[PDB]
Amino acid sequence: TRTIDRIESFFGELGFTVATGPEIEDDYHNFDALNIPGHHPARADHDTFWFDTTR
Amino acid sequence: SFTNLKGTLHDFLRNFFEEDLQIRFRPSYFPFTEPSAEVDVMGKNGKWLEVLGCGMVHPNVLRNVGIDPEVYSGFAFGMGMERLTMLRYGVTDLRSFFENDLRFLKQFK
Amino acid sequence: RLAAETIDVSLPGRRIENGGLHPVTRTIDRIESFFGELGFTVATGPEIEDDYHNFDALNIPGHHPARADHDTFWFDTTRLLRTQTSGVQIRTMKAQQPPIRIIAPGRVYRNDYDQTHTPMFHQMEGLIVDTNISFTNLKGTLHDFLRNFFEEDLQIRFRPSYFPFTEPSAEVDVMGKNGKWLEVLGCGMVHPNVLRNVGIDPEVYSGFAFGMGMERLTMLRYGVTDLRSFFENDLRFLKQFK
Amino acid sequence: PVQASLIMGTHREADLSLKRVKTLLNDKGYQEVITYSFVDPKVQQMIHPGVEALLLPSPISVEMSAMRLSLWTGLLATVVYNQNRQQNRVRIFESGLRFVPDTQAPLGIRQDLMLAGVICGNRYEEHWNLAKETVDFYDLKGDLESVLDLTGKLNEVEF
Amino acid sequence: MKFSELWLREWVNPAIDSDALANQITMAGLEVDGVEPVAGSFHGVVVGEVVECAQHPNADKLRVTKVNVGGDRLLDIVCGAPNCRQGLRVAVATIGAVLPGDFKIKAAKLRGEPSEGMLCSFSELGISDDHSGIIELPADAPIGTDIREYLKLDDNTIEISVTPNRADCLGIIGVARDVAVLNQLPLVQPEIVPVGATIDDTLPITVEAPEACPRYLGRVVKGINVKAPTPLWMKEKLRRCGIRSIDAVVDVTNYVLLELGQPMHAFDKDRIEGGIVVRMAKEGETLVLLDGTEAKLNADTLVIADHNKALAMGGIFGGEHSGVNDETQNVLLECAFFSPLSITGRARRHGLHTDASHRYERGVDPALQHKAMERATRLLIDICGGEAGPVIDITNEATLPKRATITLRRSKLDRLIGHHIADEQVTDILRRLGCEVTEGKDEWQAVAPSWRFDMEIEEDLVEEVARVYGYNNIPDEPVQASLIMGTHREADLSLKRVKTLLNDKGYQEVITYSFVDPKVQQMIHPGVEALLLPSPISVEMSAMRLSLWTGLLATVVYNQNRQQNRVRIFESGLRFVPDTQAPLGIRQDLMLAGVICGNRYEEHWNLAKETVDFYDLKGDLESVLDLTGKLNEVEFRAEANPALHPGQSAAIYLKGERIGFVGVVHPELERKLDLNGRTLVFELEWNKLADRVVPQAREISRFPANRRDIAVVVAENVPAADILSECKKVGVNQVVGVNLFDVYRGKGVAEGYKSLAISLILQDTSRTLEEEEIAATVAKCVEALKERFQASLRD
């Protein structure tokens, strides 16, 4: 947490705003749109926890 | 640009550690960036540890979300907080951030 | 036991009452955050100052109605009590060549005590100098600041004014039901005299500088009728700014 | 708006925040005040008998004619202000600089930044469970230990 | 993978440190993460022949023996690793040398038998894992030189991680070529001479689905000695790249692999029926693999098959049948290319990850097969017996991977790097990488080499120019941007601020796994359906949390076990609560949680050693929530929440709506494995209390105020919050202060009732309040107090 605040501190100064994400996420956002997509080492390689076929 | 990325990053490393090298402005691969790179610190306990990845944004990604690659560029990074931390204060086994021993925690007051 | 050992959960818990900051401190904080993210480094100066740094370096110099106009407390020909946190503007610029960028909160001193005047009070200087900076930016940045400051409730104006160490100068005056128009901050482009005597080339760099009265910002925002209440420190008063 | 570089500023982790100390102080139930830096010497002299001060020729008033040697004269003036009013029990702090005449300082005075506070009256004010005891030195001592660099050191502290 | 420095220097040899090389490859974007000598260190170990291996014995399993080096006088040594044969050319430590595990060659008889001086075996030299014992060299060694020099032992295996892109670095060649490109140097390639067939026209090989296997090379090689002994140099390049030297045929396919990137495989013609069919597997067609087990094959999985059964998965793995065995006479060499998107899924589907799968899934050069076929043919007939046969080349013009023309603008490059790399130095870096480039005014045309699977678009092409020019020497400049502030809101309250306040009320911040013991959190929340994690790191870490209450009570017990309970922790982070009305199926709400237990303070000279109770938590959160947010509006209604004591537990409100819970955990749940002494716990729905009142100054009043105490009698079934909160409403203009200062019960108060001494302070802005006016406005309260409730006398 010290390290996060610390980073936010450094970065706030340059303008950067703070966004967030939901932690339980979908195919589309964690990979697909991020140019992965489905058949790309990434998926299994990232050592991924799936809930079902997109959650 | 990239110089922007390399620059922004140096600055942030020059601040996050207070000049405890070594560092690596080193090349990498993320399908969401191109070119992309990684930093990797050493600070002993042995081998280099990855602590962030980064790249100029892959033109696919930009268009993928309604931004014209022909008019905007960008950069992105992904920092690993605990290995940042681990390095910074000299924690060994990183696994011991979520075991949450009061004795471990207390020295971080 | 689970019945027989019930307690009244609405009884007040144990703790000491919380302790907020004083309203000007609260204002200072907000502002430093606002400017924190534009990259303005925070800088201090002594509150006991000389004939050079308050006044003569800021292109007063001596035979200027200013010295008297700021109802100055002197200690002798030379030592005075800060009149403005415009000292640090000179003090900073003399220690580093540009691409500067700084605020500078402190407590200046005058000689008036009135509904909207005090023999002490606090100011926020801002300075920025680099081959780049203009009037539109001064206007741009202050508009932008006021917006966040008040959140846009209050009726402002942005006029011409006069400061021997700017040119063009400007003031913003804010109206808050009374009153009416209150001088809130004052600003301009850094007078080239003031760039020269401090060692920066005016032909290469330009800058804008400003100084806002904290207690005035603080009154208007939380509508304090009387600026002089800020230093009587009635706990009743302070506590409403927890 | 202004076109500029987004360079970082040079932070140092080992340095402590006043703003942080005030929070710790507020969390302990001290309220912040700001007092006028020029106090009355007839009284300062009472608290700091002899050690004397940078008087001010042609002041606003004679009560406001001496630069503070410390935060105490303004601090105790605030607790009387309120105690006269007729709210006893006041516990406040202030940061600010004092002004001690030093020949080997720039101009004749040593403006140091101090942190100062008073507490008095009861510990935990008027409550259905809590002990209505009047404040004592170990309360302040404790408040000071938490301020004290249990926010940095601590441990080379000696009283 | 892993490679052997001196085999790379064979292909390209910079004049630079061993250490400099490693650093230079890692800045090429493939991180070297290991460097090992290949043996331990030693001197005075030399090749020599035993010319005579006398009997013995007189010590049973030992042979006495005259051995010979170069500096003559024949050397007499004793040996008994029992493959100590007559004429062997052998590795020998001489009278004074020193072996790893630093031990000292001396001269002493062994069993009265001749003295000194040990013959060596791989193990005793630092290259681990024994063969039989006693190293057996390939005849014609330098009958007297150092084995360090002969066996090229001043060498490191150097282990690297290679990112899925740029699949051209998984043989030695690719890596060599990338290192070459860095040092401007040319890449010295071994002379690979085509073999020229000498037997039958052979073998019906049809590809049923070409798009998945464009190019297939096959070559039957008749009557080869299977148990030939893989010659040391091949045993030693193969072993220095992390491959147990298994076999003979199998080793050469491994050798070509490591050398060229190409995954070969060999078969048994005399088990293959009516030709090979390279085809997609029928859905559920089983195939018993090289390791006992079959596999149910889904209809997207290419198999190397025969005319009525399946033999081996497509560029993945073999067959407990169709491979090389004990009486294999003849073989067919597979050397093919496969479309990586027809390999990708499959291996792991079944849980295989072989050398071949790996290169095949990210792309082996489809211009490599011929060359790899010819090295693997020459290398088989040299090492094993047998002769040649026609290379059966069944390719596919079309589905053969199609290299693409990239065009790269001087601008885009300058606009994405932000640093000018001279026109003249980008063309080279591009050509030397492998491309065919035409410079063309403000732009370049590059044709992607066949072996590079990650050059498809312009930006891919600039990775490369940056990559090679050197990140080291791309300068740092800071980003130039507008200074706009972005929108602040004084009314919102940072969690940072709360974390601080919380931890000034003595509270350690904690971070907990968001997934937990499902078994465990049922005791906390009784069978409240939890979002289910099928296939997690553990059964005990398989539920997404609905409180932190689980993570936290888990965290007390943790330290409780380390002898020391007296724990005060809080945590922030989200709960995951299943909702078919959420975005996706889970409500993801930010939360604030904490737990306190044990002694109010630790061992102190002048603080009571009472343990901690409900109001200690209530005050702690009365601190947070409030006089930081707004307060005066929130309330603590009593409520049952399964896993906390009903009598001592409350829901926290805040104009109307639940914002949380606080309580001492229920007894049997504390006993439920969970540890010692009563524990207090709270959770707050953060987003609901992430917002505070911006103040407005309100007049003061220089009139003195007046205190008026009242003794309010009232049934034990009446909250005391409510009585108070009811006076400052009948309040108006004005009773300014209400305060509960006592609660009394028993003697002189009706049993089951209870008195609340209350003190209202009255102040006015207009006038200094009248003696009568006072009694009046208390009476307004006292009367409204017996509006609701009842009233009001003694204690």
Ligand SMILES: Nc1ncnc2c1ncn2[C@@H]1O[C@H](COP(=O)(O)O)[C@@H](O)[C@H]1O
């Ligand atoms: N008590 C005070 N508080 C804030 N600003 C003051 C005070 N006394 C004088 N000034 C300064 O008065 C200048 C012009 O305002 P005015 O008094 O409206 O003519 C500004 O520089 C103010 O900072």
Ligand SMILES: N[C@@H](Cc1ccccc1)C(=O)O
């Ligand atoms: N998840 C990426 C983070 C990243 C973000 C942006 C650019 C590059 C990398 C990683 O594993 O490192």
Ligand SMILES: N[C@@H](Cc1ccccc1)C(=O)O
């Ligand atoms: N009150 C400030 C106003 C000001 C400060 C800085 C720049 C311009 C104007 C002063 O007189 O110094």
